[PDB]
Amino acid sequence: TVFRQENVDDYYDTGEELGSGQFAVVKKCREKSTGLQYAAKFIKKRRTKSSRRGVSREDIEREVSILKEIQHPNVITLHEVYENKTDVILILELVAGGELFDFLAEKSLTEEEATEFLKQILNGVYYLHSLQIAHFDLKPENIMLLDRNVPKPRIKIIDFGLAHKIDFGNEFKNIFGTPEFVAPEIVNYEPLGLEADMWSIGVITYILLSGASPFLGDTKQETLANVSAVNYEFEDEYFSNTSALAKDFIRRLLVKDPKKRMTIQDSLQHPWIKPPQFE
Numbered sequence: 567t568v569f570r571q572e573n574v575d576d577y578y579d580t581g582e583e584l585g586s587g588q589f590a591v592v593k594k595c596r597e598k599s600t601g602l603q604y605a606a607k608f609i610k611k612r613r614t615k616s617s618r619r620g621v622s623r624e625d626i627e628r629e630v631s632i633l634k635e636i637q638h639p640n641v642i643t644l645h646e647v648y649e650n651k652t653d654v655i656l657i658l659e660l661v662a663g664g665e666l667f668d669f670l671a672e673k674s675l676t677e678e679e680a681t682e683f684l685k686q687i688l689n690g691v692y693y694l695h696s697l698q699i700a701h702f703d704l705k706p707e708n709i710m711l712l713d714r715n716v717p718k719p720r721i722k723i724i725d726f727g728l729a730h731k732i733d734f735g736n737e738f739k740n741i742f743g744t745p746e747f748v749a750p751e752i753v754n755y756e757p758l759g760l761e762a763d764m765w766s767i768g769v770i771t772y773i774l775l776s777g778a779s780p781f782l783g784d785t786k787q788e789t790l791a792n793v794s795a796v797n798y799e800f801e802d803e804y805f806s807n808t809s810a811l812a813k814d815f816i817r818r819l820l821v822k823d824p825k826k827r828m829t830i831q832d833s834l835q836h837p838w839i840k841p842p843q844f845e
């Protein structure tokens with residue numbers, strides 16, 4: 567699929583840098599015709615047929631296709647796409663309140679504050695999974711707040727760089743996100759499905775409640791070994807006054823066998839809730 571090839575600077579003015587990844591730099595921008603602000607994600611294209619630098623056209627088109635399908639309060643949306651010889655430029659919904667990662671760094675959360683965030687994450691993931699979209703890179707950096715200065719911030723899931731449509735219940739292409747957050751099936755290069763996101767949600771929940779990471783070792787390989795072995799525990803120092811239902815929720819997500827793990831629908835009915843890899 568080919569995108570708009572006009573100069574993005576003819577239609578937008580760019581401002582501050584919002585962040586960067588391994589694929590992209592993201593800048594605040596303002597559309598000239600409307601005065602509305604967006605996040606322009608510049609993704610560097612591959613320069614050759616066999617290069618490791620940049621992102622393949624297949625991968626860029628997948629992220630764009632997935633983003634084009636999305637419309638939900640807890641996910642970012644895609645406004646426009648441009649391209650030139652060097653970059654594809656995705657004009658994304660702006661999330662101006664910073665990462666959940668930054669917010670957590672500033673202040674461990676009460677169970678209420680943690681569930682406030684978590685219910686919104688679950689709603690966003692319920693939407694994605696209903697569409698058979700596995701995000702495959704859920705972690706606190708990829709949850710962003712609309713406004714960080716309110717007592718109950720609204721959030722949006724970002725970073726669809728690893729997202730895939732799951733047509734047959736599993737896909738096999740070795741996707742591999744961030745070691746602290748990946749499920750055992752990712753570590754073991756097994757077929758992957760929507761269940762991998764549910765494991766990541768378990769890890770996120772553990773961190774929200776404690777400020778500690780359940781599998782983190784001193785090296786990436788050690789983290790990955792810990793993940794595969796389900797080598798975590800609830801340290802009393804962090805969890806002694808945390809509710810047993812909260813621990814139950816996490817326990818039912820941090821399950822090696824993806825078939826035995828809670829689904830997104832299960833997680834919403836749970837009594838606690840219910841109303842790249844190499845060094």
Ligand SMILES: Nc1ncnc2c1ncn2[C@@H]1O[C@H](COP(=O)(O)OP(=O)(O)NP(=O)(O)O)[C@@H](O)[C@H]1O
Nearest residue numbers: 584585586587588589590592605658659661725727
């Ligand atoms: N819609 C947005 N609004 C505000 N900031 C954003 C937005 N999208 C991305 N960012 C920031 O830009 C950073 C990089 O974007 P991201 O989509 O993660 O790029 P990537 O290089 O494709 N993937 P990764 O390597 O996993 O970071 C993020 O970590 C955020 O800090």
